[PDB]
Subunit: 263 residues, 2 copies
């Protein structure tokens, strides 16, 4: 949005769109188009929504999507990051067999090489819990573009423990593919701004929108800064949000040694 | 506010007012007046603000308020709960010597007998940290009026770990004397509603207001229900807020055994 400002050195983009269940040719063509568009606007990274490549249909992924088909979508996403020359964060099933995989988020750089991979720890509801194995590792944190970036996926961000875990390892910018349906306004309206304020961090949340898999996704993709203010936000239609990021001490004051015994 | 509705069995009141530093005769007369007023409106419990009886002046409490003077204010508050026949939550320095005490919150029943006592765990800024010893115990949770009540004080509630600690021990209604100054709108505007939503609990937050101890307190006392909605709220003037309480499963889903290693 506009020329790249002085005093920003990171421009990110978020893809909000409707996937077709079980049609990864169509869904990855959409991600390829968003990646081109984001790159034309001078974004360095595009964040895409949870399970976008197969559509958000956990039971049907478990029943019908083989490890080989997930690998093929993964190879094509690595091709898109490389061919459109933009870092990409996507979210696919994990690479193991259908009975042993989780839901993952991955960040690939502008060469197509995956720099960080994270397995969703907090699965939502009985369909996700039956279709995927929850992760057991804390979120990764890595230098990229001048900041420490971290990954979480959809329901994870509603647990202040999960965002606290990223921020305690140095995260400044937490990127969150999501798939939020059913007019759940409290998540982006109440919980995300608190996660940003209570850790002094920025969070980007890229959602589906529209009719998909028997649900109607909320859209509402947003980047929330460390005052809890939206730096940029979309409504309920497909869009590409592009935001330039500018260049109490809860993280120090918290009595973590007591808190960890009280959870 | 109005007759006691059908389908509410708990009416609470919150006192919002300006204390005079180092004048506990005046400040406890104000609490006595609020207690009478709350009881006339059929409230069963009155919540009052942090350190109200001596005023919010941590350095001057450390330097000039003896253990005997704190004990005298404590005895008079127990007299007010008993003589006005209403449970009272107040917040005083702890009962030990000036060098060893913390800041506490206490709940006394309508007989004047203290049912729960809690020592503030998260102290705010260098004056509070120099004047008081932080607590080391989790918040207490107890049946009262048909619900499980818990206590926290001012900055504690800004740590999702502290509210999570109360809710994990069964709290449904968390009562919070506070002393918030400097137009900190993110606390009641962003953080309190998240604490209520992310635990499915109700929180009552009773603040000072006006000119006191070289600060200007925000008022903004509020009761926030488990959707993050204000059930009742005051502005910036002295007032008595009276609220009738009606009669995702984050607390179950959270992976606490991983979270406690990641803090």
């Amino acid at each position: 949005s506009g020329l790249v400002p002085r005093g920003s050195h990171m421009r990110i983009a978020l893809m909000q769109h409707t996937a077709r269940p079980l049609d990864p040719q169509h869904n990855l063509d959409l991600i390829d188009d968003a990646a081109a568009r984001a790159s034309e606007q001078g974004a360095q990274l595009l964040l895409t929504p949870q399970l976008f490549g197969f559509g958000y249909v956990p039971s049907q992924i478990c029943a019908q999507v083989s490890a080989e088909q997930v690998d093929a979508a993964r190879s094509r996403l690595r091709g898109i990051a490389r061919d459109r020359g933009i870092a990409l964060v996507w979210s696919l099933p994990g690479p193991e067999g259908p009975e042993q995989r989780g839901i993952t988020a991955e960040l690939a750089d502008e060469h197509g090489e995956v720099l960080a991979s994270y397995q969703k720890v907090q699965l939502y509801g009985p369909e996700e819990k039956a279709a995927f194995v929850p992760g057991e590792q804390p979120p990764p944190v890595l230098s990229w573009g001048g900041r420490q970036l971290s990954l979480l996926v959809c329901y994870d961000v509603e647990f202040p423990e999960m965002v606290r875990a990223a921020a305690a390892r140095g995260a400044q910018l937490v990127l969150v593919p999501t798939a939020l349906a059913g007019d759940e306004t409290s998540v982006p309206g109440i919980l995300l701004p608190a996660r940003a304020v209570e850790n002094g961090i920025t969070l980007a949340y890229a959602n589906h929108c529209g009719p998909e898999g028997g649900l109607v996704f909320d859209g509402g993709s947003v980047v929330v800064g460390p005052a809890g203010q939206p730096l940029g936000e979309l409504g309920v239609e497909p869009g590409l949000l592009v935001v330039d990021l500018p260049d109490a001490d809860y993280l120090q004051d918290r009595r973590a040694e007591l808190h960890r015994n009280w959870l």
